[PDB]
mmCIF file with all atom_site columns, C-alpha atoms and ligand atoms in Angstrom:
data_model
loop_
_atom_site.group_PDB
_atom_site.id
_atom_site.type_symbol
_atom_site.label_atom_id
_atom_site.label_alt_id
_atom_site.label_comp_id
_atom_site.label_asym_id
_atom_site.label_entity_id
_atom_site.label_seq_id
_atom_site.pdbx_PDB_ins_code
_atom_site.Cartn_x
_atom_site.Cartn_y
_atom_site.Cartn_z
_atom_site.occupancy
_atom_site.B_iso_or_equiv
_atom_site.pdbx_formal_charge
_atom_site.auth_seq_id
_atom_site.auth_comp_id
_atom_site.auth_asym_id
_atom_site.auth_atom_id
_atom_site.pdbx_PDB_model_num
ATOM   1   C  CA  . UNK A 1 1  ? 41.932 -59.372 20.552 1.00 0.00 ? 7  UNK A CA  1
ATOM   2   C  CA  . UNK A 1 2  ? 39.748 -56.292 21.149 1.00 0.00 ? 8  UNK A CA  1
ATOM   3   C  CA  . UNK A 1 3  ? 40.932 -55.157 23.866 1.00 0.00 ? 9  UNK A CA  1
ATOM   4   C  CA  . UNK A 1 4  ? 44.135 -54.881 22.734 1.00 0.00 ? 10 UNK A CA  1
ATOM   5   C  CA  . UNK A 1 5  ? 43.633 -53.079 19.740 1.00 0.00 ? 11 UNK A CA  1
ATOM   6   C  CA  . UNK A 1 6  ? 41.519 -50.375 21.264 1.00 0.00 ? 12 UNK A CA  1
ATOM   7   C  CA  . UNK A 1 7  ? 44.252 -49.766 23.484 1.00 0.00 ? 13 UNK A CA  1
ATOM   8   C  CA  . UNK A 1 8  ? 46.382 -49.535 20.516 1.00 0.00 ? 14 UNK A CA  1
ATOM   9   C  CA  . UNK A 1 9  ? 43.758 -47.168 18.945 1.00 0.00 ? 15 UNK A CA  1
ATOM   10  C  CA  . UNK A 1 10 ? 44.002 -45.072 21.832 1.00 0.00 ? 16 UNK A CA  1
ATOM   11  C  CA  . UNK A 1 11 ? 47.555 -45.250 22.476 1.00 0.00 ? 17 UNK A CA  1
ATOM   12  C  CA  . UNK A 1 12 ? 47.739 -43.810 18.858 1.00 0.00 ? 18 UNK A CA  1
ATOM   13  C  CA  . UNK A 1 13 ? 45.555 -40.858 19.804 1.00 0.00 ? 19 UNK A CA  1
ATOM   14  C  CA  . UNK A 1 14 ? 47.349 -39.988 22.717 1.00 0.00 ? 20 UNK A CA  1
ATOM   15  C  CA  . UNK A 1 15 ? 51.055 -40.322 20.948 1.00 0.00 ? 21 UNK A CA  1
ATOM   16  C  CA  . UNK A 1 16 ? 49.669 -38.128 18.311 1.00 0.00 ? 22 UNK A CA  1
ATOM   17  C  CA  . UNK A 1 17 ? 47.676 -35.506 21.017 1.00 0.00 ? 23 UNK A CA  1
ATOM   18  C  CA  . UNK A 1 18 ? 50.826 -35.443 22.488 1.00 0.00 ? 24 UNK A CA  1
ATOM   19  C  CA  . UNK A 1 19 ? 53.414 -34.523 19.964 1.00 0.00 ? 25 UNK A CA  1
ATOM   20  C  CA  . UNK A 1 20 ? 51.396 -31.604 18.381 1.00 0.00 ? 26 UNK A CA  1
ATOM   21  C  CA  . UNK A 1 21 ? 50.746 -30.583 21.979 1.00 0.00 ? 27 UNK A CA  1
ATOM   22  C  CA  . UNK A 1 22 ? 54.824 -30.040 22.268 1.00 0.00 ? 28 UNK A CA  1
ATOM   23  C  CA  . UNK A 1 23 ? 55.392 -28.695 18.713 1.00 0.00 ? 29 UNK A CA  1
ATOM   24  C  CA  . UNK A 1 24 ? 53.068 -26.322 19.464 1.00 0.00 ? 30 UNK A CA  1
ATOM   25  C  CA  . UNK A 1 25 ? 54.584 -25.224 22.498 1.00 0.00 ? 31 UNK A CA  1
ATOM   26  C  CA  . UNK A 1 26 ? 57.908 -25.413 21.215 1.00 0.00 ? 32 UNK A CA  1
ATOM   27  C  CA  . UNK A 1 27 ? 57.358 -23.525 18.463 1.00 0.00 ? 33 UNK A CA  1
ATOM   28  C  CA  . UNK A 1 28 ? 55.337 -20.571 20.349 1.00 0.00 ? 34 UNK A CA  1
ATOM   29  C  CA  . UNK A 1 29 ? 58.753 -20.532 22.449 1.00 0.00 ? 35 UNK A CA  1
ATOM   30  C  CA  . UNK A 1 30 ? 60.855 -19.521 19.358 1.00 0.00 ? 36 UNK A CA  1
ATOM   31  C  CA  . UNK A 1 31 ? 58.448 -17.494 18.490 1.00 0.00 ? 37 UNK A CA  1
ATOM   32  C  CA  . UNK A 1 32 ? 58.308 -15.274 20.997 1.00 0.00 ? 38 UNK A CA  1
ATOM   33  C  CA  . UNK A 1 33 ? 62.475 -16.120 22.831 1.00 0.00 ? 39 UNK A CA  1
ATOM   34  C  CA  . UNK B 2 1  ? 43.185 -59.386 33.565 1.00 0.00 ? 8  UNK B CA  1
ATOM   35  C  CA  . UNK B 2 2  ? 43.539 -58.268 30.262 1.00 0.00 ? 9  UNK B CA  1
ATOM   36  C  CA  . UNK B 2 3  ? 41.087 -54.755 31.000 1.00 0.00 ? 10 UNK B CA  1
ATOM   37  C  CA  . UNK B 2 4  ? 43.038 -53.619 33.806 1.00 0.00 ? 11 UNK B CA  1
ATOM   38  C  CA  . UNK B 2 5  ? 46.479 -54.141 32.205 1.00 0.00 ? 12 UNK B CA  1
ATOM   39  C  CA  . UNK B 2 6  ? 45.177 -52.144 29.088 1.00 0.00 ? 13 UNK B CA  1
ATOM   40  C  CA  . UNK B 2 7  ? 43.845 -49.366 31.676 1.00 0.00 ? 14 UNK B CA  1
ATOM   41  C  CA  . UNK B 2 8  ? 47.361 -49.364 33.476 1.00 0.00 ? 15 UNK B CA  1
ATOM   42  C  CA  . UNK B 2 9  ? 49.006 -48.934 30.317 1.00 0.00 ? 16 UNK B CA  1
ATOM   43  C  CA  . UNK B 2 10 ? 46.679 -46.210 28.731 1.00 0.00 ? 17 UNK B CA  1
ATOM   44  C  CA  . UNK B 2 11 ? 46.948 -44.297 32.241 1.00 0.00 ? 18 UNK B CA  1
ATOM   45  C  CA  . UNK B 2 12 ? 50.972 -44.676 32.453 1.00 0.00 ? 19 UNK B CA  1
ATOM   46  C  CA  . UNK B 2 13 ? 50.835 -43.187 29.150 1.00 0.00 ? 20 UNK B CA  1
ATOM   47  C  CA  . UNK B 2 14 ? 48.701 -40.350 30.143 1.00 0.00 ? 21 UNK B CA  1
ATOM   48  C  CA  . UNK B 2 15 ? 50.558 -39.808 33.019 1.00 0.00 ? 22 UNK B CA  1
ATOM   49  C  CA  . UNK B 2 16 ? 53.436 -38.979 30.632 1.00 0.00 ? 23 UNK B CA  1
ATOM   50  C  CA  . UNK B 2 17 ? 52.209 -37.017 28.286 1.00 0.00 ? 24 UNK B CA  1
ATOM   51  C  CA  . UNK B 2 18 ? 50.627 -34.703 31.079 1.00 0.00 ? 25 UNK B CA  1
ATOM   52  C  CA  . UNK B 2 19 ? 54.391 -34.088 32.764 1.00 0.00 ? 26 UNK B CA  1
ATOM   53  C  CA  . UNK B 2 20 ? 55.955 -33.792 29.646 1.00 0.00 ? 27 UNK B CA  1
ATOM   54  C  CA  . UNK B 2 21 ? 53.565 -30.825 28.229 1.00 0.00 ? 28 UNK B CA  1
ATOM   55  C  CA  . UNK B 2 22 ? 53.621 -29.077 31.802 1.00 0.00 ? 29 UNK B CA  1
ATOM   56  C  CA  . UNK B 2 23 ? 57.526 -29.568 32.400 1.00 0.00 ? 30 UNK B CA  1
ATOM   57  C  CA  . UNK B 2 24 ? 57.430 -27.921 28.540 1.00 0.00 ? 31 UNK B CA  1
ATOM   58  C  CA  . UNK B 2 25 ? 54.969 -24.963 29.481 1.00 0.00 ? 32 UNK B CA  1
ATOM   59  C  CA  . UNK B 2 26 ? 57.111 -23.900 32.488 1.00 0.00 ? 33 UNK B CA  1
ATOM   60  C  CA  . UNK B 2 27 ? 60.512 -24.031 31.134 1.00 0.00 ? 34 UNK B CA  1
ATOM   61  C  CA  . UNK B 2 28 ? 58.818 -21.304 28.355 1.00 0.00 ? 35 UNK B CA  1
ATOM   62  C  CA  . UNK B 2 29 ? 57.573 -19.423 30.781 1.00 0.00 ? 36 UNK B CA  1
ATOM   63  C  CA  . UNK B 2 30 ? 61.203 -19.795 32.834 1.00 0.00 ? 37 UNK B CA  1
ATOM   64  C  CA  . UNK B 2 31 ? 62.330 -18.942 29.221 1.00 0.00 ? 38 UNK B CA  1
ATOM   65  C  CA  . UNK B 2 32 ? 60.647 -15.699 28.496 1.00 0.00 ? 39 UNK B CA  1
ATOM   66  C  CA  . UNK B 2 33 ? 59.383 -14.504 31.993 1.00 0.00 ? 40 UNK B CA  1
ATOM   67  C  CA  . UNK C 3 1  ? 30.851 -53.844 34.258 1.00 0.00 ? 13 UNK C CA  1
ATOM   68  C  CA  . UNK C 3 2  ? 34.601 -53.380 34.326 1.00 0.00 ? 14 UNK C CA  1
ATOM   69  C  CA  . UNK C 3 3  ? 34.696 -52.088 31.008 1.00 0.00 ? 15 UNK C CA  1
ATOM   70  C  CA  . UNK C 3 4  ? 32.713 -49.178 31.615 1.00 0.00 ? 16 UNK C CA  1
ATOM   71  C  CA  . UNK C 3 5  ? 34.975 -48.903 34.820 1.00 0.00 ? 17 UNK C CA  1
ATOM   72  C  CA  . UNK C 3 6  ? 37.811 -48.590 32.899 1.00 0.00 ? 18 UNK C CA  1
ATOM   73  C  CA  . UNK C 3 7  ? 36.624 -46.257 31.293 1.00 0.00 ? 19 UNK C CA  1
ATOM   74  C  CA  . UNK C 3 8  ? 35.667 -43.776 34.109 1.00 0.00 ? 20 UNK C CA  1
ATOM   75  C  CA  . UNK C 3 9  ? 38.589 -43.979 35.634 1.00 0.00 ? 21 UNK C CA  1
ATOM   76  C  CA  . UNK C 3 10 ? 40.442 -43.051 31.932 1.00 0.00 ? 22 UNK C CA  1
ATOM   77  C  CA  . UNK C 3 11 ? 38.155 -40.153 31.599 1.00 0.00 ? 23 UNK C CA  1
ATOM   78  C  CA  . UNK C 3 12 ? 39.006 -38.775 34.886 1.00 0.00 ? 24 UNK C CA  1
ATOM   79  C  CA  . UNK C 3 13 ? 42.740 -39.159 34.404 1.00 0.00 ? 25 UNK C CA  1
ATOM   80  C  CA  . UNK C 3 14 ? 42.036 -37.160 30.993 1.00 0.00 ? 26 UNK C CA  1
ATOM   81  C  CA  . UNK C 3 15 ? 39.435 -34.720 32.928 1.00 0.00 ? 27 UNK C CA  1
ATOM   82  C  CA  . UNK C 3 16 ? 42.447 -33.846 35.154 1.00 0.00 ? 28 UNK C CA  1
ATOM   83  C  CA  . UNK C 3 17 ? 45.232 -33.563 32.536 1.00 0.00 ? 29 UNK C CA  1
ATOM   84  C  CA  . UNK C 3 18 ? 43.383 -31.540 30.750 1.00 0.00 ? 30 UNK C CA  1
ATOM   85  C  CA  . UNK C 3 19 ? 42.413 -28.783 33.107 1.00 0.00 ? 31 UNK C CA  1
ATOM   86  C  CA  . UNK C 3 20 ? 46.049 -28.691 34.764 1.00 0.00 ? 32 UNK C CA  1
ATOM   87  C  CA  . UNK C 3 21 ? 47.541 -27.784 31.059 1.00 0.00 ? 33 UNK C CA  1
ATOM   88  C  CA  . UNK C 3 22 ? 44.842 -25.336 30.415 1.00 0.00 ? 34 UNK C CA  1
ATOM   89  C  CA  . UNK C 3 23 ? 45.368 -23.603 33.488 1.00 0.00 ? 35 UNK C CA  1
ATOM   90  C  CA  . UNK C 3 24 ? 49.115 -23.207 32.751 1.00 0.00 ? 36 UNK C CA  1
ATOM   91  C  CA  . UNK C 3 25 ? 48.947 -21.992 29.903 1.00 0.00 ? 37 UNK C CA  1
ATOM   92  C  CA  . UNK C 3 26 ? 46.502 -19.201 31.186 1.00 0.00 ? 38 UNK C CA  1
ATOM   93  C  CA  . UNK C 3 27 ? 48.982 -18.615 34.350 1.00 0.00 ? 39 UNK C CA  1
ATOM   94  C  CA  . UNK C 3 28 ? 51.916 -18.563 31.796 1.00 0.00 ? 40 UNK C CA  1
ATOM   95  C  CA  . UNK C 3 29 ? 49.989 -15.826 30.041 1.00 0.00 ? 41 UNK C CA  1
ATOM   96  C  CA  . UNK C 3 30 ? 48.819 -13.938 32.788 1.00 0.00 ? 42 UNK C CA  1
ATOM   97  C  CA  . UNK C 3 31 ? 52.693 -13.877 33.963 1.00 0.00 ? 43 UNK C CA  1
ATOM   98  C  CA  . UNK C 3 32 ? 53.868 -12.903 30.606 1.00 0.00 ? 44 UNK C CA  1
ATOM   99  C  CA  . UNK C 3 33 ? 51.324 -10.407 28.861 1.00 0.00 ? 45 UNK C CA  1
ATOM   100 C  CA  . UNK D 4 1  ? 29.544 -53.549 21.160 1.00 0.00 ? 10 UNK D CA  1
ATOM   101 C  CA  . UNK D 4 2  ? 31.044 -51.981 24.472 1.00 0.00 ? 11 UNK D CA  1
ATOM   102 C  CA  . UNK D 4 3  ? 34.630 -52.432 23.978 1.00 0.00 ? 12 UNK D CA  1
ATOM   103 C  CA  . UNK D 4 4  ? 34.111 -50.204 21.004 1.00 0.00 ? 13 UNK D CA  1
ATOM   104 C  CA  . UNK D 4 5  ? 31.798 -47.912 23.161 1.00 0.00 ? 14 UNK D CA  1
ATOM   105 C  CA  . UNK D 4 6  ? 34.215 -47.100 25.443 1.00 0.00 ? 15 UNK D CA  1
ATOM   106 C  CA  . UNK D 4 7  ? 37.300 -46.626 22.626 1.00 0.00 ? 16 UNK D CA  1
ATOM   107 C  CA  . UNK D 4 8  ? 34.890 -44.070 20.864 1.00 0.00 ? 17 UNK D CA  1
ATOM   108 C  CA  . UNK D 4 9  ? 33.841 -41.883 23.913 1.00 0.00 ? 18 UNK D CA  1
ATOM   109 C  CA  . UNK D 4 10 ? 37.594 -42.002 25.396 1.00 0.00 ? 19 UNK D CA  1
ATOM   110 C  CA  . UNK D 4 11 ? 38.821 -40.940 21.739 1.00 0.00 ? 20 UNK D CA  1
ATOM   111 C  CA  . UNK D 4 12 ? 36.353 -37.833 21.775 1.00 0.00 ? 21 UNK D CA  1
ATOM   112 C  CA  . UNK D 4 13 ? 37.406 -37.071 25.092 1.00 0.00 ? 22 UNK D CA  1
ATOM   113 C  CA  . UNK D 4 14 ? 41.056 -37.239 23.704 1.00 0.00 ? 23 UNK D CA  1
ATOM   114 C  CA  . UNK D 4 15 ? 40.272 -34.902 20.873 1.00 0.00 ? 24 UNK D CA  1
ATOM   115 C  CA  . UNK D 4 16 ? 38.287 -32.542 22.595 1.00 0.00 ? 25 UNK D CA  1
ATOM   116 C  CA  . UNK D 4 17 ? 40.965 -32.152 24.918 1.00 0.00 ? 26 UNK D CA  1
ATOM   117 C  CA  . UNK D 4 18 ? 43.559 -31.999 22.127 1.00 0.00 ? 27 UNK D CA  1
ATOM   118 C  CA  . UNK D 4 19 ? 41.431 -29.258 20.575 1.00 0.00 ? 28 UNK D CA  1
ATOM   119 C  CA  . UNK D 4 20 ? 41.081 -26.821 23.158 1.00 0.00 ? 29 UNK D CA  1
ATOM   120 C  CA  . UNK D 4 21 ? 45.379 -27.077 24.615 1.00 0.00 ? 30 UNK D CA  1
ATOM   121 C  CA  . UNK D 4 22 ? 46.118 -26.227 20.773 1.00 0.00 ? 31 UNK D CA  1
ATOM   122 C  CA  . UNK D 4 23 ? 43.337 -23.168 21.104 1.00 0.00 ? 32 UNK D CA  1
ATOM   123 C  CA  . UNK D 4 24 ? 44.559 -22.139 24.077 1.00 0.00 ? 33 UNK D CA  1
ATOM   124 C  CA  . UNK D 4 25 ? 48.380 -22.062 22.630 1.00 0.00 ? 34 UNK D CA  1
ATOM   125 C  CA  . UNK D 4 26 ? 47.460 -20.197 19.719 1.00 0.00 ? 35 UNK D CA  1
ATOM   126 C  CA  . UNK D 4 27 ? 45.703 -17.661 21.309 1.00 0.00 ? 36 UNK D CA  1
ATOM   127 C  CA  . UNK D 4 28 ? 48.259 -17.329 24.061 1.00 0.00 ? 37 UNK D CA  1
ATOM   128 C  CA  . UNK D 4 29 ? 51.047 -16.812 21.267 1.00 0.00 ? 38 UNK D CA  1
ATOM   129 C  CA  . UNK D 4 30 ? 48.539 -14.394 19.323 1.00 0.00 ? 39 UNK D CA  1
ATOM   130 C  CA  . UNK D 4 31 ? 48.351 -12.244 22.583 1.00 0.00 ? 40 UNK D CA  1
ATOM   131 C  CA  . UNK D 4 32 ? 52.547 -11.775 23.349 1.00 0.00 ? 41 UNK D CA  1
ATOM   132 C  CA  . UNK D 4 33 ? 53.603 -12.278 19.607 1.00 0.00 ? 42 UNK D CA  1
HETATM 133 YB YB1 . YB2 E 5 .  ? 57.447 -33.826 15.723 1.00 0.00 ? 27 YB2 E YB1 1
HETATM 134 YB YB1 . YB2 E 5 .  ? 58.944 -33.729 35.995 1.00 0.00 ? 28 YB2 E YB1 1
HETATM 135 YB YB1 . YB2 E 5 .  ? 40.581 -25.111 37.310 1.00 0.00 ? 29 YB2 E YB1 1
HETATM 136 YB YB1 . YB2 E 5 .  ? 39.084 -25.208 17.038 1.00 0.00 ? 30 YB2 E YB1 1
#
């Protein structure tokens, strides 16, 4: 089931692009407010 | 149709992470400016 | 060749993300400092 | 191998992306704060 589990590969990627993408936004917000 | 669902699924899930991280990046701008 | 199909279309829905949260960040800056 | 073809180039797309929003933060923060 290949194609499956690249899509889980990628779906991976993006969870984990995504999450530091809001930390880090989130964080630069306290930061600075 | 086993690509296409995988494509639909990986786009949905860019399609969220993209809103999320803008809606995030204005309300800290709404924040501080 | 759907796979490589697929894949386009992926890379433009990551093409566009991409460049819509760069540029606002850089118009959150611009507004702020 | 193109299943796996297409996972790596959309994964480097992924973390390029990734790479430059967290830049972009940073710098943005390191400029108001
Ligand atoms: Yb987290
Ligand atoms: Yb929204
Ligand atoms: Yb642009
Ligand atoms: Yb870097």
């Amino acid at each position: 089931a290949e194609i499956e589990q690249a899509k889980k590969e990628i779906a991976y990627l993006i969870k984990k692009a995504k999450e530091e993408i809001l930390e880090e936004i989130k964080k630069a917000k306290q930061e600075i407010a």
